[PDB]
């Protein structure tokens, strides 16, 4: 009767930028998956391939807890075939994802009057994320053809941008928690069950 | 990378950067204007410099890349709205001079003071004390006093400085390439590159002259029945030829002729109607009022209020000794704060304010999603005949007695018609001529038509001319009259006015058609109506993304201004006026004058 550390990704103090988004591989535990869905404290709570109706039912080998936080227009972009700064730059699914998607309002705990600029995305990038790729580069874009020598000038734009979390804000603009739950099942031990 | 893509990473940045630096200088002037202290002035200030310093640092980053490149029109508006020069095309010594002559003129305006004879201590500035007489006053030599007095000691002041303000204004317009300033405020109007919906700068003076000689008539018929129902008040006065003497018209100018109604109304006998008893006799507060209004445009389709609308608004008087700017106002502050700004009392005139000011919200939040540059109305008339079209519904007796406001026993009579028909004539059709009037004497100073020592003589021969109004005091050069007034002193176009009455009219008509109305125009109410909703949404949306001619033609079918809705509208009254003018002289001599 391990229980899967679900507390310390759901519950964490500060979540990370979209950008560096934060991975942790769940194993060797017993997840009560029911307890999520069927808690009612999230606004997103939607399952591709695998279904949130007590499918903790199933055995997995490795589980992966993707967190991160975005504004609640972004939300639509963490899902299979999406596109946006979200889903292109900073964080992007597959298209044959096996998973869960899991968003709740934050604003909260991440928005503060004068605004919050600890959470930032890349809002340039040469070319697209490939699926569960993570790029924190801090390298300055180059939009035209002259170098940049690593400094911020014309056609040079540093490639992150903060979001300004204030608790004005509309829905749209307001701070989500963002956790995606991949399954993973290869030709090997099977250690997360979790009746 | 080409230009353009050079171009849409650049517009890319800036979106990003300015949508949180316009938010925070809009969320310190909120504070200062709920609040009103001396650390919030400050902080005001500090954070509308910083998004001015950035406004100026990315205009000139956007003027490196040059508009002959792009192609994507969508790309190329945001580009020049950026671009523009403005003052900054002149030396800094020429913009440092501009910016002293402006601020000298507000300050003359706002500051200038009137005192009485013998006492030079009981002095009354323009608001409240000058306009006070202006528009409540019946004795003529009280009205006369403060007419003159205005102009003799404040518009004086402001002949020199208003005659170098034109000088600097011309040549920071033709160093932006266009024939003179009044060319450039012209501009707001230019569409070009999408066929079949451009519009010249020149041809707005063609179609204002145009749909103006089709008022001449609902004028006319309005100003002699004015003039002879004056004549009966003032008959050592007014000549039954003559024009209107300027100082008897119910504010300082004769902008509005609204106070005129107490000595021009038709049926003197037939009370308005006043449903400010009936709201508090149910005992209704400023949420009823803004509740009442989301409702409205719910009922026609569009979306409620924001939830932080109701949290974050300000729709009471803070009342105590916390004081705040109480000017009605919509707050599109962005990132989807969307805010109203009013000191509501439980008036049926607050009832009103509050759906005009609504209407802006709904305008505000349908074009959210455009490019930042783009969230603003298709032209400048565009915003504030969607306001006004929305106290037309929820002022109709139809509208108040589905909300319990109005009695179910009171139906209209034509005379109850006419009365309301002529209140809002001399409102809405007195203001045109004198609109027109002062935009066209504009234009052509700027133009250079009109000589600096004969500025006042044609200032004065137009007003006979065109507005039928006439000086009652002979002024000479050394007035600066047209200053006078705020928009002239403060450097704010005008012909916005006039263009945007006729809008509201093409809306209101349109929508009305939309909504199966049947019967006057005038009494019309969209409510329920989720097909004038949608007609109206699908150019609210587009924002200023598409030509104006194109989000006009969205609303009404039509690509351009029209005055045959206006006319319309006004029809019953028109139709009474002619018959009441049977036995008096239509139109005006213009020789005539009060001083003889
Ligand atoms: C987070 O904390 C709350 C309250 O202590 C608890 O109900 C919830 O289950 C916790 N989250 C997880 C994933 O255990
Ligand atoms: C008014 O402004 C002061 C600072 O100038 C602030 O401390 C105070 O809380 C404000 N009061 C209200 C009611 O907003
Ligand atoms: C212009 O560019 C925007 C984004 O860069 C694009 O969505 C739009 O379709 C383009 N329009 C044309 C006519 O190319
Ligand atoms: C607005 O309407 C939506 C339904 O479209 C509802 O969920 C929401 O609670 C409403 N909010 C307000 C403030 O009326
Ligand atoms: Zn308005």
């Given at each position: 009767?391990?229980?899967?550390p679900?507390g ?5 103090t ?14 060797n535990?017993?997840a ?10 999230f606004?997103?709570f939607?399952?591709?391939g695998?279904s ?12 992966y ?6 504004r609640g227009?972004?939300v639509?972009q ?5 596109t946006?700064?979200?889903?292109d ?5 597959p298209?044959?994802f096996t998973?869960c ?26 070319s ?5 790729e993570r790029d924190?580069?801090?390298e300055?874009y180059?939009?035209?053809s ?9 056609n040079?734009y ?12 509309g829905?749209?603009y ?18 997360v069950?979790?009746? | ?13 800036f ?5 949180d630096?316009?938010y ?20 005001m200030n ?12 990315q205009?000139?980053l956007?003027q ?17 709205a950026?671009?523009?020069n ?10 440092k ?11 003359i ?7 009485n ?5 009981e ?12 528009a ?6 009280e ?6 007095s ?17 000088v600097l ?12 300033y009044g ?5 707001d ?8 919906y451009d ?25 002699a029945?004015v ?29 509005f ?5 107490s ?11 006043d449903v ?10 400023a949420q009823?009022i ?9 009922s026609?389709?569009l ?13 009471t008087?803070?009342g ?14 962005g990132?989807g ?10 008036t049926?005139?607050?009832?009103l304010?509050?759906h ?9 939040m ?7 540059l783009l ?10 005949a ?6 037309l519904s929820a002022?109709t ?26 209140k ?5 059709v ?7 009037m002062?935009?066209?004497?504009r234009?052509?100073?700027?133009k ?6 004969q500025?006042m ?6 007003k ?18 047209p ?6 002193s403060?450097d704010?176009?005008?012909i916005?006015?006039?263009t ?17 109305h049947e019967?006057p ?11 004038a ?8 949306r587009?924002?200023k ?17 029209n005055?045959?809705?206006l ?5 019953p009254l028109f ?22």
């Amino acid at each position: 009767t391990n229980l899967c550390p679900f507390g310390e990704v759901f519950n964490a103090t500060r979540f990370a930028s979209v950008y560096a988004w934060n991975r942790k591989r769940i194993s060797n535990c017993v997840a009560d998956y029911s307890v999520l869905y069927n808690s009612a404290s999230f606004s997103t709570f939607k399952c591709y391939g695998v279904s949130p109706t007590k499918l903790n039912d199933l055995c997995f080998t490795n589980v992966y807890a993707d967190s991160f936080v975005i504004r609640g227009d972004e939300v639509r972009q963490i899902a299979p075939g999406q596109t946006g700064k979200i889903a292109d730059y900073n964080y992007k699914l597959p298209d044959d994802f096996t998973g869960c998607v899991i968003a709740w309002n934050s604003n909260n705990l991440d928005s503060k009057v004068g605004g919050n600029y600890n959470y930032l995305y890349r809002l340039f990038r040469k070319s697209n994320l490939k699926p569960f790729e993570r790029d924190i580069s801090t390298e300055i874009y180059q939009a035209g053809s002259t170098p940049c020598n690593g400094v911020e000038g014309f056609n040079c734009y540093f490639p992150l941008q903060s979001y300004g979390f204030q608790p004005t804000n509309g829905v749209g603009y307001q701070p989500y928690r963002v956790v995606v739950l991949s399954f993973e099942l290869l030709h090997a031990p099977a250690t997360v069950c979790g009746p | 990378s080409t230009i353009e893509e050079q171009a849409k990473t650049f517009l890319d940045k800036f979106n990003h950067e300015a949508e949180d630096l316009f938010y925070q200088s809009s969320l310190a002037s909120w504070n200062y204007n709920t609040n009103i202290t001396e650390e919030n002035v400050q902080n005001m200030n500090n954070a509308g410099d910083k998004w001015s310093a950035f406004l100026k640092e990315q205009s000139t980053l956007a003027q490196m890349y040059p508009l002959q490149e792009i192609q994507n029109l969508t790309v190329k508006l945001q580009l020049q709205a950026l671009q523009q020069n403005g003052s900054s095309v002149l030396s800094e010594d020429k913009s440092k001079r501009l910016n002293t002559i402006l601020n000298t003129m507000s300050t003359i305006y706002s500051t200038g003071k009137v005192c009485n004879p013998d006492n030079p201590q009981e002095c009354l500035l323009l608001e409240p004390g000058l306009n006070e007489i202006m528009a409540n006053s019946l004795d003529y030599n009280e009205r006369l006093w403060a007419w003159e007095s205005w102009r003799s000691e404040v518009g004086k002041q402001l002949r020199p400085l208003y005659e170098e303000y034109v000088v600097l204004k011309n040549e920071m317009a033709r160093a932006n390439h266009y024939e003179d300033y009044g060319d450039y405020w012209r501009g707001d109007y230019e569409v070009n590159g999408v066929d079949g919906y451009d519009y010249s700068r020149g041809q707005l003076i063609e179609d204002v002259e145009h749909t103006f000689e089709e008022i001449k008539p609902l004028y006319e018929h309005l100003h002699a029945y004015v003039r002879a129902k004056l004549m009966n008040a003032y008959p050592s006065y007014i000549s039954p030829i003559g024009c209107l003497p300027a100082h008897l018209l119910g504010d300082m100018w004769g902008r509005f002729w609204t106070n005129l109604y107490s000595l021009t109304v038709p049926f003197g006998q037939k009370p308005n109607i006043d449903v400010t008893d009936a709201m508090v006799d149910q005992a209704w507060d400023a949420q009823r009022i803004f509740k009442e209004a989301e409702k409205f445009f719910v009922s026609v389709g569009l979306p409620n209020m924001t939830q932080g609308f109701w949290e974050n608004s300000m729709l009471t008087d803070p009342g105590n000794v916390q004081k705040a700017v109480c000017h009605p106002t919509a707050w599109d502050l962005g990132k989807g704060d969307f805010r109203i700004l009013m000191c509501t009392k439980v008036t049926m005139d607050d009832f009103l304010t509050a759906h005009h000011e609504m209407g802006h919200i709904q305008y505000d939040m349908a074009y959210a999603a455009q490019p930042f540059l783009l969230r603003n109305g298709a032209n400048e008339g565009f915003h504030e005949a969607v306001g006004e079209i929305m106290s037309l519904s929820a002022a109709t007796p139809k509208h108040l007695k589905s909300i319990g406001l109005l009695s179910p026993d009171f139906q209209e009579d034509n005379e109850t018609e006419i009365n309301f028909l002529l209140k809002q004539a001399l409102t809405i059709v007195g203001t045109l001529p004198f609109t027109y009037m002062l935009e066209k004497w504009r234009w052509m100073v700027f133009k250079g038509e009109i000589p600096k020592d004969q500025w006042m003589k044609k200032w004065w021969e137009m007003k006979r001319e065109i507005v039928g109004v006439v000086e009652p005091v002979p002024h000479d050069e050394t007035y600066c009259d047209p200053a006078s007034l705020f928009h002239v002193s403060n450097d704010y176009s005008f012909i916005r006015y006039y263009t945007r009455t006729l809008y509201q009219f093409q809306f209101q008509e349109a929508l009305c058609q939309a909504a199966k109305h049947e019967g006057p125009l005038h009494k019309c109410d969209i409510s329920n109506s989720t097909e004038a909703g949608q007609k109206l949404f699908n150019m609210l949306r587009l924002g200023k993304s598409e030509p104006w001619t194109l989000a006009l033609e969205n609303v009404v079918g039509a690509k351009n201004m029209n005055v045959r809705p206006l006319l319309n509208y006004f029809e019953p009254l028109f139709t009474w006026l002619k018959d009441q003018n049977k036995n008096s002289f239509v139109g005006w001599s213009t020789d005539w004058s009060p001083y003889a």
